[PDB]
Amino acid sequence: NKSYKFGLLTIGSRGDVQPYIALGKGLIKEGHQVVIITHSEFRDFVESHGIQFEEIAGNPVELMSLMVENESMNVKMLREASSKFRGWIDALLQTSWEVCNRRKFDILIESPSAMVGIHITEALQIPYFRAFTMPWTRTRAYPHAFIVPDQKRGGNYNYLTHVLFENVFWKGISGQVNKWRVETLGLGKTNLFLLQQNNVPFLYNVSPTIFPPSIDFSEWVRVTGYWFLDDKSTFKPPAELQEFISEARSKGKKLVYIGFGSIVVSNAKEMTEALVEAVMEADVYCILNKGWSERLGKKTEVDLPRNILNIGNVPHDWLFPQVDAAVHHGGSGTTGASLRAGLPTVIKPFFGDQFFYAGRVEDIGVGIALKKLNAQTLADALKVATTNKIMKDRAGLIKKKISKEDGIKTAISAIYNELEYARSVTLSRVK
Amino acid sequence: SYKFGLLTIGSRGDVQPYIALGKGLIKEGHQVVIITHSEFRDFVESHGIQFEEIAGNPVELMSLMVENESMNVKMLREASSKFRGWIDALLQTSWEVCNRRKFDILIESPSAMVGIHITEALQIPYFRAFTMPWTRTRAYPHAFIVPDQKRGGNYNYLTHVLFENVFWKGISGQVNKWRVETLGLGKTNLFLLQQNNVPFLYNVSPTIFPPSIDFSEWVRVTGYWFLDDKSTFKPPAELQEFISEARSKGKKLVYIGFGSIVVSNAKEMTEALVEAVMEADVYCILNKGWSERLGDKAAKDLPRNILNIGNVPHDWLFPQVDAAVHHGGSGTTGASLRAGLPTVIKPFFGDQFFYAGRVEDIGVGIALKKLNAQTLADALKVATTNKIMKDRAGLIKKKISKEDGIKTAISAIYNELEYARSVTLSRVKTP
Numbered sequence: 001n002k003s004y005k006f007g008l009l010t011i012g013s014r015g016d017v018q019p020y021i022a023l024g025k026g027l028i029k030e031g032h033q034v035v036i037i038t039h040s041e042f043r044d045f046v047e048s049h050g051i052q053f054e055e056i057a058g059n060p061v062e063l064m065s066l067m068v069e070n071e072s073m074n075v076k077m078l079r080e081a082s083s084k085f086r087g088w089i090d091a092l093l094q095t096s097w098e099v100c101n102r103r104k105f106d107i108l109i110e111s112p113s114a115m116v117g118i119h120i121t122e123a124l125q126i127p128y129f130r131a132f133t134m135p136w137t138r139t140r141a142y143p144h145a146f147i148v149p150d151q152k153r154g155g156n157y158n159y160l161t162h163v164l165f166e167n168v169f170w171k172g173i174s175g176q177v178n179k180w181r182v183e184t185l186g187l188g189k190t191n192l193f194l195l196q197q198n199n200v201p202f203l204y205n206v207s208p209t210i211f212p213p214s215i216d217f218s219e220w221v222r223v224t225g226y227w228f229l230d231d232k233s234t235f236k237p238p239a240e241l242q243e244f245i246s247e248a249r250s251k252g253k254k255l256v257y258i259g260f261g262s263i264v265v266s267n268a269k270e271m272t273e274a275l276v277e278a279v280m281e282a283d284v285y286c287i288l289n290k291g292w293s294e295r296l297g298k299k300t301e302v303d304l305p306r307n308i309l310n311i312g313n314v315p316h317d318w319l320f321p322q323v324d325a326a327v328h329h330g331g332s333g334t335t336g337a338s339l340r341a342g343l344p345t346v347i348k349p350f351f352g353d354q355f356f357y358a359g360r361v362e363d364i365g366v367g368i369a370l371k372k373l374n375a376q377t378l379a380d381a382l383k384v385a386t387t388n389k390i391m392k393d394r395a396g397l398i399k400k401k402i403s404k405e406d407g408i409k410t411a412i413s414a415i416y417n418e419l420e421y422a423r424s425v426t427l428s429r430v431k
Numbered sequence: 432s433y434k435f436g437l438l439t440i441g442s443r444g445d446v447q448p449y450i451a452l453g454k455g456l457i458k459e460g461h462q463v464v465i466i467t468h469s470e471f472r473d474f475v476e477s478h479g480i481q482f483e484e485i486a487g488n489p490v491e492l493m494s495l496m497v498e499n500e501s502m503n504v505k506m507l508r509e510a511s512s513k514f515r516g517w518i519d520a521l522l523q524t525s526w527e528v529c530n531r532r533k534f535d536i537l538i539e540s541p542s543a544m545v546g547i548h549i550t551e552a553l554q555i556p557y558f559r560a561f562t563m564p565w566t567r568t569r570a571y572p573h574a575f576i577v578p579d580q581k582r583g584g585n586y587n588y589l590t591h592v593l594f595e596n597v598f599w600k601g602i603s604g605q606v607n608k609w610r611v612e613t614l615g616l617g618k619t620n621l622f623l624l625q626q627n628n629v630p631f632l633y634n635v636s637p638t639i640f641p642p643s644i645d646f647s648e649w650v651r652v653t654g655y656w657f658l659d660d661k662s663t664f665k666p667p668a669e670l671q672e673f674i675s676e677a678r679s680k681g682k683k684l685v686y687i688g689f690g691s692i693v694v695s696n697a698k699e700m701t702e703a704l705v706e707a708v709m710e711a712d713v714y715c716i717l718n719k720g721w722s723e724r725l726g727d728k729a730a731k732d733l734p735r736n737i738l739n740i741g742n743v744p745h746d747w748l749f750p751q752v753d754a755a756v757h758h759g760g761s762g763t764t765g766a767s768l769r770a771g772l773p774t775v776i777k778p779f780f781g782d783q784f785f786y787a788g789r790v791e792d793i794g795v796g797i798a799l800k801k802l803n804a805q806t807l808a809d810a811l812k813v814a815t816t817n818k819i820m821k822d823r824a825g826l827i828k829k830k831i832s833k834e835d836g837i838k839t840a841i842s843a844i845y846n847e848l849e850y851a852r853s854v855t856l857s858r859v860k861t862p
């Protein structure tokens with residue numbers, strides 16, 4: 001409608017930040033001003049795409065670091081973890097308020113894992129939107145992203161996981177948040193009843209093919225489509241990668257990507273050896289994007305054969321159309337990239353919403369959820385994913401449906417259509 | 432001579448071990464009352480133990496958790512109100528019993544919630560007893576927060592801290608009202624309760640649940656408390672003929688029974704079991720308890736090699752079969768391990784996931800992730816023919832048979848009694 005200053009706020013990893021870059025670029029092209037508010041590590045990434053950056057604390061790697069490496073006695077580790085956690089929350093609260101209160105955004109869009117947005121927008125009296133890539137609103141259709149059961153349960157169970165999560169999350173931070181609300185933001189104390197979080201317009205930046213809206217979604221909870229960044233333009237592929245791909249094809253071998261993102265594992269070399277053995281057993285060429293290790297870190301430890309190339313990060317929109325299947329961790333964005341390219345997809349989930357997407361790929365018939373990762377289960381899965389016609393057709397159909405979605409345009413329309421509602425929701429919390 | 436109150440809520444598996452312990456205490460010259468739901472009166476009294484009724488039967492809550500598609504804001508209000516009424520009835524009935532009976536010592540399953548408060552009001556020694564991981568430790572995750580696959584010790588420890596906080600804060604409003612209005616105490620919180628001080632009896636074998644070096648000296652893994660009903664059981668003719676037929680035909684004989692569960696499609700599950708049993712070419716004693724709603728199909732159709740029987744005492748039946756497939760309930764797992772059976776576990780809820788992993792880890796059985804005709808057929812083949820697994824099951828039988836859980840628990844009670852008194856008094860208001 002007219003030129004607004006957006007603040008787009010998120011914490012987490014690349015997959016929390018990249019969709020906001022895509023949305024930010026789209027908003028800039030609609031005439032608006034955009035600041036992405038996230039961790040220092042992502043400044044160059046954000047600025048390389050023409051978006052303004054502001055730093056906040058709240059980097060979850062800091063918390064993961066204490067769960068892996070702290071090896072003091074039990075109660076000491078717990079005290080040290082609680083204190084680090086409390087200090088990390090405090091820094092997130094204080095840095096996010098300092099940015100927002102200085103910049104005077106017209107509109108704030110936030111991932112709700114960042115916690116601060118509903119309070120900050122109340123203090124500044126501005127429209128507020130949530131956006132996220134995993135189930136996070138009350139519904140019977142899907143369990144909460146962090147409480148996915150081993151196998152599907154009924155709708156009341158799913159609904160109750162959301163109620164439990166919202167209560168655990170709030171009550172875990174409510175002491176610190178209410179102190180900050182009172183001492184710093186100038187507000188009164190709040191609780192779940194006053195926050196009415198389920199009133200806030202919510203943008204699920206995922207395809208409705210994988211995450212269809214549920215019969216019980218509110219009107220302002222919208223599944224927009226993935227917010228794809230499109231980095232194939234400007235990517236200059238290194239020679240080794242081009243030669244490897246051409247060699248696979250010249251030799252008539254199937255070509256697979258394997259990559260589990262960043263993870264910490266018990267035995268790095270054993271995992272690598274099981275992947276190598278699996279790739280040898282299934283007669284395949286493998287583009288490997290290793291990010292596992294015993295400590296946070298330093299990639300390839302053992303002698304890899306001719307049919308395996310350890311490459312860094314390569315933009316998936318360039319690579320995925322050229323391979324026959326992909327094996328990955330089921331991260332929301334990575335799943336979007338494999339589905340967008342019509343790849344049969346093997347997922348080995350490790351944490352959180354990866355379990356959600358692993359089940360969804362199996363349910364939609366486009367891939368296989370690995371329970372156990374070893375040389376045999378992966379070799380079987382690689383055989384099915386590179387030869388099963390039904391699965392390839394289902395992956396093709398999903399590719400077709402995703403190509404007709406335009407998640408960014410849908411999300412921007414949703415913002416314009418919901419702006420006045422979003423303002424009204426904020427103002428209802430003002431006393 | 433002491434007057435023991437043994438207090439528990441839940442199902443038969445929560446009550447049966449206390450019967451066994453109660454009989455042992457009576458033979459040591461003590462008095463025993465078991466305090467649980469009306470449904471178990473006949474069971475308790477048939478074994479010569481005194482019974483007192485309390486409310487708090489989790490079946491009442493299961494209704495709302497396990498219905499399909501009712502959940503929404505209004506249903507959640509009705510569910511909260513029902514939950515609050517259920518808690519209140521448990522609180523009031525348990526206080527009425529304990530305050531009238533004046534036990535010298537209370538031993539409680541901590542899922543019952545009330546014991547730590549009641550013993551503080553009456554100033555008596557308090558013990559906990561339970562059959563799944565419930566004390567802070569790095570060695571095991573909390574029973575209700577078992578990860579998909581093993582994580583590190585810091586992760587395990589933190590699941591216990593999270594669980595303790597969630598459980599307490601879920602009930603603390605109502606418990607504190609009752610503490611003040613009814614018990615005559617002040618309000619409390621997790622910090623004041625110091626729950627990890629309380630002497631704790633894990634009534635499970637240390638072969639399946641070995642103590643960790645980080646277990647406090649008052650946390651004891653005693654061995655299972657077995658009831659032993661084989662000598663009174665008169666097998667019906669159909670069962671005898673079936674057992675004799677399996678053996679005369681040289682077929683392996685398996686028990687399959689998942690207890691009481693609510694599933695999405697009852698007939699499909701039954702058909703997958705039938706197909707699996709045919710493929711493995713075994714004879715199956717089936718104890719069906721699954722249905723689409725809590726209303727009763729122990730009935731089902733079945734071929735000659737499958738016999739639907741009711742409940743049969745497992746200490747009679749498990750010695751007569753070659754393997755067992757079950758849900759991994761703590762008591763049922765103890766019965767299959769005690770009998771030296773290779774054990775297939777398909778977990779559904781809670782601590783079943785803990786025991787499923789433990790049987791796989793000690794090499795006596797297989798954990799099913801997915802239950803279908805193929806996974807079960809493969810598992811039934813391994814469980815009835817793998818020599819290594821049968822040997823390992825025999826060795827575990829030997830280790831269990833050398834434990835005397837009852838005698839160990841009674842000694843632990845006498846050895847920790849003064850400490851148990853002291854822990855209660857530290858919570859008590861100094862006059």
Ligand SMILES: O=c1ccn([C@@H]2O[C@H](COP(=O)(O)OP(=O)(O)O[C@H]3O[C@H](CO)[C@@H](O)[C@H](O)[C@H]3O)[C@@H](O)[C@H]2O)c(=O)[nH]1
Pocket residue numbers: 012013014015016018133134261262289312313314315316317330331332333334335337351352353354
């Ligand atoms: O070599 C690479 C690696 C990644 N990507 C892209 O980068 C994004 C990664 O997204 P995602 O898989 O969502 O991010 P991760 O940071 O890898 O995953 C974490 O963050 C996600 C969003 O919070 C969660 O879904 C995951 O469970 C969590 O592990 C996607 O667009 C990928 O296609 C590439 O183009 N090339």
Ligand SMILES: O=c1ccn([C@@H]2O[C@H](COP(=O)(O)OP(=O)(O)O[C@H]3O[C@H](CO)[C@@H](O)[C@H](O)[C@H]3O)[C@@H](O)[C@H]2O)c(=O)[nH]1
Pocket residue numbers: 441442443444445447562563690718741742743744745746759760761762763764766780781782783
């Ligand atoms: O036909 C039968 C059925 C049961 N039993 C015995 O009854 C007890 C049942 O114990 P358990 O499996 O502990 O009880 P359930 O009530 O089936 O299981 C619930 O309660 C347990 C203890 O709280 C939890 O470990 C389980 O996860 C939960 O499902 C065991 O000793 C069995 O051997 C028999 O002898 N014959």
